[PDB]
Amino acid sequence: NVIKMKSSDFLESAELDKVSLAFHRTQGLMIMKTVYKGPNCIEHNEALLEEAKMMNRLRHSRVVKLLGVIIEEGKYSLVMEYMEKGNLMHVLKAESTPLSVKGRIILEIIEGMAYLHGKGVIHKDLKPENILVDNDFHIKIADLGLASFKMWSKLNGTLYYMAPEHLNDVNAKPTEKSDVYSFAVVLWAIFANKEPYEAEQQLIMAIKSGNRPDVDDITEYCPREIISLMKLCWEANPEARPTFPGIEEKFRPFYLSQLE
Amino acid sequence: LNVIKMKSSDFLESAELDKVSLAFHRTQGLMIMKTVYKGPNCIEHNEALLEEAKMMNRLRHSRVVKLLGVIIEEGKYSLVMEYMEKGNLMHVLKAEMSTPLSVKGRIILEIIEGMAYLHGKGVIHKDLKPENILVDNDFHIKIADLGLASFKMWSKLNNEEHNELTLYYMAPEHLNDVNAKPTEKSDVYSFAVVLWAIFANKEPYENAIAEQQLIMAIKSGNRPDVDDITEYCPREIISLMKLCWEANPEARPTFPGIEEKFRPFYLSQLE
Ligand SMILES: Cc1ccc(CNC(=O)C2CCN(C(=O)c3cc(Cl)ccc3Cl)CC2)cc1
Ligand SMILES: C[C@H](NC(=O)c1ccc(C#N)n1C)c1c(F)cccc1Cl
């Protein structure tokens, strides 16, 4: 179960924009978030470690693997796999992705979210920043803000992807349909190549009042069946929105016949 | 959803195959029907049989077969699965003799993806073999349990007196063992002989004469002749199969372990 790491395992560690590049002795390049550095904490190590164990049980080709956890005297860090091309929005913005690649990106997003929901894991904050892209344009879904992990989160454009049921009511526990809304605005982002809603306080009333992204800003050719999908995936009533198994059953045929 | 309980009237026609039968549904298209029992009207095992069909319908993944429905009628019991056009894996290997390494590598990766799902649900496949690896029109695969190994109640309903109707892939621990208690490693052994079959385009052990000659010789160390598959199998796949068919099961890896290494190898070398 455990891969408890030590700081000693890493030869060097170059800082990033507390996220940090880190070269492991036997295992190569990795990315390390040191979430806390301070006094020796009250005994929540077991809780933190059990939570890290739960992150580590999430093992799937389209989901990021937590490779290890470092809990030293006044130093708490998590360690993940190195993804070369970074987040999805950076890949969309940096230079001209083909429809075949984006279609596959969508299929891998669906495959990954389906796994997550299949493990009883709702993603509270799904968005392009949380979709990391490797060297060969294959993706992995991530929770870089630690939204779903309560204890690590406590130890430390997000409103745009959040469902209107949550904009109304902060006490509302999310569901499988919460993420399908997010997935819809992700789809729009994938064909718009930009973050939506190009003021913060004012916008929240409009979205709860029915507003969605401007579809006429998708100046790139997006297929009708994908535009159909996002409209359905962002419906205001959650019971109207499909499940990810329902989306996969339809979209996998569509990918292979038309997109691939 | 639940399982769709179907009626016989739902199918327009049903032509027999190698009791497996091709069957066209009214609204829902071409399907394959295994009619497991036809005889007198059975004792109330229906609830159990239906519960069993419900339970095996929870097994939902891109690389395993969907039970589409179940027919429970007076003295006629059938399961209905999805139609896979190119048939089982060995039929694809033999009838083509035309399959690229890239496609075979992908077929292996799909077998790994599927077995990983099954084991991830706590389901051991007792009888894994090429006959149980079904191939669609686009050479994509789905794993199946056509002998009803994992379906205890339906398998018992077949063997019924009243009804009017593997050794090559078996791990040596299970050879000559009536109390064969399977593990995740049971399937990995089978997976190894499957890999060999994928590159040999044939069943193993074609110079074996007696059955007891085969069973004892395998338990005494024998595997499929690797000299049949130096015609082009990569060394890393031959390495894998040797490892996956090791006589001590503790040496053999898990399917997640196989996937972590093999998926990189597929994309860099094979695809
Ligand atoms: C809902 C859901 C979806 C997918 C997953 C799969 N695992 C994860 O995302 C890990 C969460 C923990 N983590 C990090 O905090 C992290 C963040 C940065 Cl910027 C850099 C380095 C690190 Cl180590 C690693 C990745 C978990 C939950
Ligand atoms: C998920 C798959 N399902 C069938 O094999 C299946 C579906 C329909 C029929 C029929 N007839 N079968 C055997 C399956 C199991 F349920 C149990 C064990 C292995 C596998 Cl591969």
UniProtKB/Swiss-Prot annotation, chain B:
It comes from the Eukaryota. (Microbial infection) Proteolytically cleaved by S.flexneri OspD3 within the RIP homotypic interaction motif (RHIM), leading to its degradation and inhibition of necroptosis. Changing A197V: In a colorectal adenocarcinoma sample; somatic mutation. GO terms for biological process: amyloid fibril formation; apoptotic process; canonical NF-kappaB signal transduction; cellular response to growth factor stimulus; cellular response to hydrogen peroxide; cellular response to tumor necrosis factor; extrinsic apoptotic signaling pathway; inflammatory response. Homodimer. Interacts (via RIP homotypic interaction motif) with RIPK3 (via RIP homotypic interaction motif); this interaction induces RIPK1 phosphorylation and formation of a RIPK1-RIPK3 necroptosis-inducing complex. Upon TNF-induced necrosis, the RIPK1-RIPK3 dimer further interacts with PGAM5 and MLKL; the formation of this complex leads to PGAM5 phosphorylation and increase in PGAM5 phosphatase activity. Interacts (via the death domain) with TNFRSF6 (via the death domain) and TRADD (via the death domain). Is recruited by TRADD to TNFRSF1A in a TNF-dependent process. Belongs to the protein kinase superfamily. TKL Ser/Thr protein kinase family. This is Receptor-interacting serine/threonine-protein kinase 1. The lineage of its organism: Eukaryota, Metazoa, Chordata, Craniata, Vertebrata. The chain holds residues 7 to 294 of 671 of the full protein.
